[PDB]
Symmetry: C5
Subunit: 310 residues, 5 copies
């Protein structure tokens, strides 16, 4: 009969969420309870009823007794797992308690930035049993798994935390146990309001206000400058994401700013040649519509982006 | 009866304080005195009264004698702890002296940047007993714990250092000991006066002085440039912080600069159209108030920020 | 007779493709099946028919029995291979199953950026037998090798995956086995359309539209600014590549932008001196051709680049 | 009687001096000669008169014989010491020769940037005896300690190298030996002349030359631009230092550039309003003093900075 | 009699050349053949004629037999050497074959940037015998040492590869063997033509062409902008080098650009005041020489730089 391996994973810190590399790093602890009756002992007269081991001594003991351990792997770990404690407690009836405290980075392949920065992302850690389920069957350790009270993450807010058990077939024909700890996180938007939204809005609006001069050349100069600045914003914002194969909401907004600025310049050149070839009064009359249409474009385009993505 | 484990933590260096990642790194040393009578020995004729061990040999000896060690964990450590010395001295009556010298990064989850750069932050290191308090009870080693004389930190100044003992329930139903070494630090403000405050003040004041030209178009051009520069300052300053979900005092000051610059531009456009449609004398009379109100806004807004945050 | 070593390499993650350093990093797993009859055992009465080892214990056992293992090396690995599991399963007839799970960076010396960003690159991992082929002959493990379902790579798309066996002579006069896992990848072009192509097109076209002012000095000013911006784009784009000894398609396009902008400026200076020394009407007539030739240059040059590289 | 431990530290490379983190990294080698008569042996017939050990085997031998080793610590090491060789040679009379070759970073808490870039800094490595001086007394190994011939450091020049012995009380009530290797270094100034001094001088002087136009508005525009550029220089230069709590000479020079530029702008606005309200001839007469006082300010301020700091 | 240690070093990859840190990183392999007759064995009946060891087991065997190994050190290694394989093959007559495959960074203290980017640099790896030459004498392993076919380096081209044997006295009074593998490399210049040379040439020439306007103020404005851009190029280019104590050819060229631009501005101010105080015709006549002398300065200065450095 397969042996039961109870698994608990506890995330104590989120040291970082790297959206460009699409990974996240955590400090967490793994707890395993596994009753192996072959490990049963009897303490000596007035002798310890629980035996404490390093991971190394325990594995050497298991090899000497020819006992297979429930070997596992963090399936989506990437890089070096920095271990703090790898401790074993062995009770008299053969129950092995294992504590593994670590820091490690994990892949986040469910990142979808289409709604960025209004996106809710899925983060998980997979713990895979290497041996098949007719040898070991992972269970859920009760009252341990989850997320901690001081995760130390400022941009992200955890919205849902979940655990469950599934299967994998990485190395065996038969099914092998997989423990999953997953959580969902959304962003705090204050950073994007302050550093991205409000600057762009101020530039656009300050341009509109300066449009009341009635000097078409000034409009063209200012609009060219605004386009340059918007392209600087494009490069800055794109730096923080991966080189995605699809368009983000932020990309749509920035392309809108590019296009609206260019159309502003074009309309101003038409007005300036209208005033150049004698049509100054027609130029001013149409300047009325230029003013009364600069912000209609931005409102309408914002509604269009909302309709598309949401 | 529970065994007493005396704990001392000494911080010798602050190698860095990373406010963006909200962590800090230290070079420090841990001292543990723990009397285990089972470890008592007798030296041979004219033989050493104290035995020196590596951590590895000592733990193998403890496992061979089936003695549980007071296993501990740096609860808020993140990443790899680089150990320098892990030494053991065992006296004849069984007193274990342990020296652990290390470099490690630690989480700083109490960072609150609301008053930045006038903030005083709390930094701590937690040392957790893995086993419950009916087995081991942490005490305070006397005359060892604290902070050193050459911390090597230039921006921060330590204001208070403290130690105490509390409990945790990370891995056991029963309470387990927790040793805390905490200190409070504030910033030196010279960097912010020289690189942030004085440049912004110079830009604002040089703009005001140039406002005495009486050429409204020059005001608009200069103000647009000033707004661009202030947004560059926004991006630079925000780069050094995390993507906070709340507004910092620095954010409030930068938003004030944005808004005041935009209002300057708007007032200048109104003046320029007043001079455009025949009201040159009214334009100049109101230019008087424009000048006499440019700095009132900045003083009043600075007082408003002080009132809000302090 | 040489011993057969069956090899399987599975790539589970592409943690990154570094085109500047010309390397790529993966999380993957290596599987080796190797029948060594000298390792045959018999389980005790009702005793395990498969023995589980750490890599270290197994190698010590092999050394004690004076059995040569099929030593191998990742020929194009660079840096530190971070191992997760190094596990051994030994069956009763002497079949060794080895599992090696790792993270490592690998050289990508086949990077050819001539068509960048329309390039398809070759990535491979070489696994080399250190000992010659009269001792060990690598075979292909069936149903294991390849690439996974969640590679986590956003810019690149895998187009072909392949495995095969070849030889090398790194350390022996005789041939030694080499296992190769290779795959081809191309880029998603969305990043380059949004962040590179469309901004450059907008700048060029907005310049052309502003050319309808009929103010030659404005043309010269705007063109100088455009040249400056294009050189900023040159530096940015080149930052992401290595310091290649040959010209990339992107380099050709940027040099074209430089030259076309300079020719624009030159033509405008000629027009401005034509209008300066009395030939205003001739200046305007030729301005017709200036306008009707600004975009012909860009279309013709784009066709020329396509002809050259493709 | 305390045992003599002769110490030699040799610095072979300076891999880097990090003035922002206030540390420096070296490749060096440590030599220890320590006569322990308990380690005396006799070679077998025609057998080696010197025994070669790894550090690990030697420490296991010492533990088996219950011999305390002279445990030491690099007191100002920070981070991971990457060891190359840790070798032991044991002669027949019990003299242990130890070779430790390493790479490591070390704290530089004596950095004082007040005169930067004309500063001479103190760099040291402390080697601390953990055990008190009634057990071990550090001596100086003769003809080994110092700095090498190829340090590989380009910006810094070593001016003085010194060794000596002192005491510490880190872990014991009694005094413990401390070996110090210190050296003083100054900078090559060519980098600062070429990249900092000459650009600033060129900007200032080119501004002065352009002041001979007699167009006050051009002066104001150019001066505003110069102030912006000087603030860019401020941010760049400050990036390379820590966030110091005191003013550097470079900070004083940059603040001088800010202030002189602002005063230039102010004087030009006064001249422009003098010419505006009818006083063109008075404006020109005072423009004479404006010109004849622009460089007096810079010379006088440079002398003032020299007087203050030197 | 001293024992012969045959040495072969093979460089398979150049993972990077870091000219700012003046180091280079390689993936390479070390081969050592060393006949120690004390290691001679006899295989059992039908038993392996060659014994395979890990480095650790072999060193423990050597210590047990009290055999001194030829201990060596990579003299100019800096940082951590990441080992891939450390394998031993021991033949029946006692010949030890050692394979060491590694990744490591090495100091490049022969970097001389005076002719940069037309410089040919010397790169070497030193392998030092720790023990003196009356114990071990390094020889050259034949047919192994050198550089590989896929070095993976794009900017540099290897021009000469060499090996030889010399001596050192690092740790012993007597001479100890030193094996040297050195190679010379030069740069591909395409990067510097495309990203540095051609942009600067375009800026200079586009300025000259715009000089045919005959509007001195435009010349001054454009020249000031060009000086600013050249100083940006100075900072960018200097970022990639160390903070050298001497002047590079690139530094000379950039200082030339600064000075020529400033002289352009000065001449234009003189022309503008000549036209201001009534001498418009003299101003134009001398403008002829201004034009006919702008490029003479650049050609003459380029010849001067060539004469100085070459
Ligand atoms: C006065 C009381 C004294 C009694 C004993 C005190 C505490 C006992 C010490 C237990 C620590 C185990 O000792 C050592 O710890 C570190 C991390 O902590 C482990 O970790 C080390 O190797 C593992 C290998 O994966 C790495 O993850 C890790 O980066 C590295 O530092 C070591 O492999 C272990 O050998
Ligand atoms: C002439 C006198 C000679 C007498 C002996 C001299 C000194 C004795 C040497 C004691 C050092 C112990 O030897 C070695 O030291 C380093 C750090 O120092 C330890 O540290 C190493 O493993 C631990 C694992 O967590 C890591 O933290 C560390 O990054 C790594 O370098 C080694 O695990 C230890 O095996
Ligand atoms: C309740 C059940 C408990 C039963 C036992 C549970 C699991 C058994 C633990 C097996 C892990 C092996 O133990 C340890 O693991 C880490 C990685 O995982 C290895 O890895 C360590 O050394 C290798 C050396 O190349 C490095 O690649 C790696 O960076 C480092 O962390 C250690 O060398 C190994 O000693
Ligand atoms: C044909 C002749 C062959 C004869 C033998 C040849 C040479 C003998 C090899 C001696 C090297 C010792 O073997 C190994 O070396 C590396 C560095 O070199 C050491 O270093 C390793 O652990 C220490 C721990 O602090 C770290 O500093 C280091 O980053 C890590 O790589 C290993 O701990 C040691 O086990
Ligand atoms: C089915 C066949 C199975 C038969 C056996 C298969 C192969 C045998 C495995 C040999 C590898 C040796 O095992 C392990 O490898 C890694 C690198 O590879 C070594 O390297 C490790 O320690 C050294 C110390 O300097 C470091 O350089 C290195 O960064 C670290 O990963 C380990 O010290 C060694 O213990």
């Amino acid at each position: 009969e397969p042996s039961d391996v109870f698994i608990g994973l506890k995330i104590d810190q989120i040291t970082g969420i790297n959206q460009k590399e699409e990974n996240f790093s955590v400090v967490g602890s793994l707890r395993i309870d596994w009753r192996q009756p072959l490990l049963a002992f009897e303490h000596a007269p007035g002798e310890p009823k629980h035996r404490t081991y390093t991971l190394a001594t325990f594995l050497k003991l298991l090899e000497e007794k020819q006992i297979r351990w429930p070997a596992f792997t963090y399936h989506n770990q990437q890089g070096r797992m920095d271990f703090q404690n790898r401790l074993i407690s062995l009770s008299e009836d053969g129950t092995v308690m294992y504590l593994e405290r670590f820091t490690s980075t994990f892949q986040a392949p469910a990142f979808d930035f289409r709604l960025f920065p209004f996106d809710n992302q899925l983060f998980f850690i997979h713990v895979d049993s290497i041996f098949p389920q007719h040898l070991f069957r992972f269970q859920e350790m009760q009252g341990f798994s989850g997320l901690g009270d001081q995760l130390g993450e400022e941009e992200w807010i955890v919205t849902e935390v979940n655990t469950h058990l599934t299967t994998h077939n990485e190395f065996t024909k038969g099914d092998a146990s997989r423990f999953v700890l997953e959580f969902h996180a959304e962003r705090h938007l204050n950073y994007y309001l302050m550093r991205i939204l409000i600057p762009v809005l101020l530039i656009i609006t300050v341009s509109w206000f300066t449009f009341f001069l009635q000097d078409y050349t000034k409009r063209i100069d200012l609009a060219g400058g605004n386009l340059l600045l918007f392209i600087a914003f494009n490069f800055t914002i794109s730096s923080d994401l991966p080189r995605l194969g699809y368009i983000t909401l932020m990309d749509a907004f920035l392309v809108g700013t590019f296009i609206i600025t260019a159309l502003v310049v074009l309309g101003n050149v038409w007005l300036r040649r209208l005033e150049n070839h004698g049509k100054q009064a027609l130029a001013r009359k149409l300047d009325i519509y230029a003013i009364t249409s600069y912000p209609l474009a931005y409102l309408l385009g914002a509604l269009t982006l909302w309709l598309l993505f949401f």
